[PDB]
């Protein structure tokens with residue numbers, strides 16, 4: 145699909161059996177989701193942006209459904225104010241910026 | 244151009260006759276640039292990112308070139324970790340997301 149940027153590029157995602165709203169974010173290296181349970185192992189990580197840094201849990205090899213497109217990758221879980229789909233998963237669904 | 248997301252979508256911008264690197268950032272509502280001199284009056288703005296909120300200076304109707312594309316709009320100036328081109332100017336240069 146072609147998504148215009150008049151409003152926030154929000155999409156419905158399926159992660160860990162849960163439906164969530166998430167922002168397609170080209171400024172984010174990684175994907176970060178609000179507090180939730182994910183299976184398997186994790187390690188602590190710090191991610192930085194505007195306002196500074198937050199502590200997240202890093203889960204690797206996680207499957208997510210984005211607009212019907214399944215993708216696998218690392219997902220960070222923590223106190224993000226917005227669910228964000230970052231470049232690590234945006235690449236996997238074939239998402240580009242066009243102008 | 245078509246910009247893939249395997250690396251950061253970093254572009255050259257021109258503001259005040261100066262070349263700068265900036266990030267095409269679909270997750271940002273607004274355009275935020277690191278400390279610099281801009282003409283005219285500013286007004287207060289608080290913007291919320293991953294690590295919280297920062298105060299910025301809002302300058303309206305600023306002439307800015309982005310990857311050779313001419314835009315005129317609002318530029319926020321403050322303690323941003325990187326120059327970011329948000330949706331306010333991405334829409335001006337006709338930028339969309341495609342997959």
Ligand SMILES: CC1(C)SCN(C(=O)[C@@H](O)[C@H](Cc2ccccc2)NC(=O)COc2c(Cl)cccc2Cl)[C@@H]1C(=O)N[C@H]1c2ccccc2C[C@H]1O
Nearest residue numbers: 171172173174176193194226270271272273290291292293
């Ligand atoms: C470093 C940056 C270029 S600065 C802005 N940024 C980004 O990814 C931005 O798109 C960011 C995303 C976001 C949206 C809503 C709430 C909070 C955060 N937005 C912002 O920082 C601020 O955006 C706004 C403005 Cl400018 C005005 C009004 C309202 C808003 Cl939400 C990058 C970043 O934080 N990236 C980090 C990030 C974020 C999420 C997941 C992983 C990572 C790694 C790291 O790369």
Ligand SMILES: [Cl-]
Nearest residue numbers: 194195196322
């Ligand atoms: Cl900051």
Ligand SMILES: [Cl-]
Nearest residue numbers: 216217218232
């Ligand atoms: Cl990954």
Ligand SMILES: [Cl-]
Nearest residue numbers: 235238247248
């Ligand atoms: Cl590709």
Ligand SMILES: [Cl-]
Nearest residue numbers: 315316317331
């Ligand atoms: Cl504007």
